[PDB]
A paper describes a structure:
Alkaline phosphatases (EC 3.1.3.1) hereafter referred to as APs, are widely distributed enzymes that hydrolyze the phosphate monoesters under alkaline pH conditions. Recently we reported extraction of an AP, termed SPAP, from the bacterium Sphingomonas sp. strain BSAR-1, exhibiting several unique features, such as constitutive expression, thermo-lability, extracellular release and high specific activity. SPAP requires Ca2+ and Zn2+ for activity, while magnesium has no effect. In conclusion, three dimensional structure of a substrate-bound alkaline phosphatase (SPAP) from the Sphingomonas sp. strain BSAR -1 bacterium has been determined to a resolution of 1.95 Å.
The final contents of the asymmetric unit are: 526 protein residues (31–556), two zinc ions of partial occupancy (0.75), 278 water molecules, 5 glycerol molecules, 1 Ca2+ ion and one organic phosphate in the active site. The overall shape of the protein can be described as that of a shallow cup with a thick base. The two active-site metal ions (M1 and M2), which were identified as Zn2+ through X-ray fluorescence measurements, are 4.1 Å apart. Zn2+ ion at M1 site is in coordination to polar atoms from His 491, His 304 and Asp 300, while Zn2+ at M2 site is coordinated by His346, Thr89, Asp345 and Asp49. Structural superposition confirmed the catalytic residue in SPAP as Thr89, which was also suggested by sequence alignment. Unaccounted electron density was observed in the active site region, and the volume of this density is larger than that for an inorganic phosphate, and therefore, we have interpreted this density to represent a phosphomonoester, ROPO3, substrate. One of the nonbridging phosphate oxygens, O3, is sequestered between the two zinc ions, while the remaining two, O1 and O2, interact with residues Thr89, Arg173, Asn110 and Lys171 in the active site. In SPAP, the corresponding torsion angle is −60°, and the hydroxyl of Thr89 is pointing toward the phosphate, thus confirming that the present structure is not a product complex, but is a Michaelis complex relevant to the first stage in which the phosphoenzyme is formed. The residues Thr155 and Glu322 in ECAP are replaced by Ala174 and Gly295 respectively in SPAP. These changes abolished the third metal coordination site, and therefore there is no third metal bound to SPAP inthe active site. Interestingly, a lysine residue is recruited into the active site of SPAP, and the position of this residue is such that the positively charged NZ atom almost overlaps the water molecule coordinating the Mg2+ ion in the ECAP structure.
Residue numbers in the entry:
A (entry chain A), B (entry chain A): 31 to 556
Amino acid sequence: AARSIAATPPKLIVAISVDQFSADLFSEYRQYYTGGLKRLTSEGAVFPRGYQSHAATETCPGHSTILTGSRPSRTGIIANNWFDLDAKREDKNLYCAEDESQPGSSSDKYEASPLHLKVPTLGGRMKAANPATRVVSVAGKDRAAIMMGGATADQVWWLGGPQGYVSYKGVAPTPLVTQVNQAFAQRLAQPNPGFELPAQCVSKDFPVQAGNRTVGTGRFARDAGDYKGFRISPEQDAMTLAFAAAAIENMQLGKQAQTDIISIGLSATDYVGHTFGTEGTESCIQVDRLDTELGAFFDKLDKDGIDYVVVLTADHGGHDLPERHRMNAMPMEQRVDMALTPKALNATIAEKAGLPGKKVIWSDGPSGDIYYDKGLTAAQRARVETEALKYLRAHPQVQTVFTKAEIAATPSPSGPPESWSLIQEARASFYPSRSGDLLLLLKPRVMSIPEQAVMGSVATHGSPWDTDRRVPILFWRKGMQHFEQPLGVETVDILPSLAALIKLPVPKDQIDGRCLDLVAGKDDSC
Amino acid sequence: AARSIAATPPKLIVAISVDQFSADLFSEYRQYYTGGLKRLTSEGAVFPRGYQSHAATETCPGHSTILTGSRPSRTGIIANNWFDLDAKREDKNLYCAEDESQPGSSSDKYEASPLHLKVPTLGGRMKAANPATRVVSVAGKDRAAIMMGGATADQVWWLGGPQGYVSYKGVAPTPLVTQVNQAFAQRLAQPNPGFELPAQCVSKDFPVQAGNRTVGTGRFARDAGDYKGFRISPEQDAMTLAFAAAAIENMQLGKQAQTDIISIGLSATDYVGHTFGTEGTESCIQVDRLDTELGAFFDKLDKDGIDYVVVLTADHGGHDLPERHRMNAMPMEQRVDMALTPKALNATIAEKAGLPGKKVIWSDGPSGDIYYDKGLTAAQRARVETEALKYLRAHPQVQTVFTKAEIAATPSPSGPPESWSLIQEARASFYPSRSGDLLLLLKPRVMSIPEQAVMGSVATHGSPWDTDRRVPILFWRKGMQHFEQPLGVETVDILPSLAALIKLPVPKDQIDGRCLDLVAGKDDSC
Ligand SMILES: [Ca+2]
Ligand SMILES: [Ca+2]
Ligand SMILES: [Zn+2]
Ligand SMILES: [Zn+2]
Ligand SMILES: [Zn+2]
Ligand SMILES: [Zn+2]
């Protein structure tokens, strides 16, 4: 049994990103794991304080770091959406994982593509070193699959809707995929009675009102054919893992001479967290199912005799809805002023700049990147920068605003990510040609979803604060020596850590991360 | 069974401080608790990210916050030792828990006293409101017992050495105490074979060299009569808990009309952490024994039918020795330059100020408070401040140095403790008449114990960084509703939280902490 994680190159790397699986949520339920998460935390190399270190704590930037060893300042994936005011097409909003150069495309109707990603992934690097490498990537969300797989992946599949898993335009379903989609279709057509509460979820079972919604007691009961219900539930993760297992077996991943790699993006935790917040029965059930399904997944790989190493992490952390925080000893938790949402803020700034009724800024939400309209004249732009800063810095819920020049002037951060300044975090997701003219950051404990009568999502991530940056990073291979390392590491450290195990050279000057030693005690895998 | 923590006033408050039980160490072993810590974490109000929020993360300042609702800036307990250069006696170094006005006293031979503590404790406040209140405080260290009990406590006992538990000068052992000390004497006179490793400790069993010492594989085997061995082991915590249980029963605490309070300072985790670091078999065994002994302690109270509420926390966090960190993926971990220790630094600064061979500064260690010698003339003092700052700020291991005026100019901090600036942390343990003229803070991951041939302690706390500030805070009462709140709270919040349960008014302007709601969901104990 006892065997060093670096004894020989693993034959399969399994990289799992659990979307919105924050270190807080991970740590809370840690004492109840009995399945796959138990395996990882009791036997693996455990870094409970990993960091998606940059400020833009969203899915695309986060997934772009996991298998690239690169911060969003290098991957170019600085948000889920960014503005290119010089874009040919009408819609200046660009989706992180689209090819906007395609005719008749818009951010609402896009063609999936890894074109925006500026660097190779680990799979891309492995394939460059050895053409026989298979690189597979499956996920619940296109952006997760696409950013982990990279431009040279062999198979990139994601959940497209009620039809099941799909890929890039032109890519026909393989027999495995049609079989998976048949099973998915059969599961979807059946009602789901829901889940009774795990023992640990009983305490979380109370209703919380937020606008017209009540959350906190959901059990994922759903009607037949309810695709939205299926998506926002543990069912989609179970299906994604079954798909991954089927692909692993069908392609004989890890059964050939070279090392293969499969990346797996489990999206459910994130839909659940947005829809219900993170401390109710919904997230609790979801994490317990995650533990159980991961256990079954690992058991199947074991039974197949595959020599695999697993890394499991998240694309970012998350934060509970203010309404429940206020019931659980956090009375200062609040929702962002509606005055800071795109329409309102532009109108306000216009009127302050003396350009009332005009369009002087573009923004995507009540925080993050803000862009000055290109039409503005030099003097107009100057009045906009002055007035925007003056108004924002005076707002009670605003922590700070950085100018583009201030961020650019900041050196790429180094040292412990848990103690970075806000501008260092900003610099880590700064890419001059895509980033805003200003960066707006809200105070801690301000949720960037305004209070509304009719609400959709009640909770979100995307802030520069610790809840949203901190994520677990867990490495495991059969027989290795467990250790726990509570000091801060970055998700950009993942690539060089894995590369060391398979003796794949990676030029240090092409990445941001550093190699994490995965061998407890004297010997060093780096 | 089901019953709100605020349904009625508890009859007994049990406050437990586990010395150096950092949130990191607490979180690491959380999945293995089966005893008293399991009870607290699965059934209680769990705040896994509590903060000893100030910069001076030492035992005395930490214990001074737990039952006072007050930061060290208000308690006046700003360190374990501070200089009073105007003191009458020769030794200008004052111990936090002594009365230096006593003749022939020195910091090496002092008379224990709570005189330095500027504010009442919860016990003191309860007794002020109701004279029938019993206030008891027992600990492994005098400073823990003294600071949690306060000046009006009925019984304050601490481990004095091979003779067992002692109190203030003049206080005779009671029959209970002589009985406890008899049992302790019997335990001490027996060899201890040591402990075999709990399953979770097996992975930690490898040797680590630090100077002339090897740590990482200890099992607490000890010879008969080895008091040092007894002190640096789980044995002392077992004895302290048995003493507490015996006192509770003997005095019928919680069995009368009024609420009584007992504070318990379990010191072993801290001795073990200093002596061996925090990630080896020694700390692992110690935490497992802690869990088991706490379980037996709570079971005895339950069997006695006592209506008690428990709060459990730590006086500060802690940090592993650099030598093991470097083996476990933290290669940048290092020991502080010897040049920064008291003797050396003074000599250096003297020579830079043009007062070579003189005594221009006083300091206690390679970080923290520095004091200018009173003998210095205005101009001399000015050259010292200039040269000290210049030299320190240039040193590669120094994060920053604050002047006294800079800290004084800082308002008492508010808002989330996890995101305070360093000067805010400094302000939180700043007390003008006791604090230094300068405050020296080392960079993250610099251990403030220099590398030496012959070493004693290999690891310590006392830094302004997150490992040393972050501590668990756990509240429990039979039948309450469990909840977990991962956002940052302060240990100064403990007093008003407990006071709310027993309907004891506490003027907000006399404390720094705020009341934490301990009732999950809609109802609020505050
Ligand atoms: Ca409540
Ligand atoms: Ca090693
Ligand atoms: Zn995400
Ligand atoms: Zn999300
Ligand atoms: Zn201590
Ligand atoms: Zn200590």
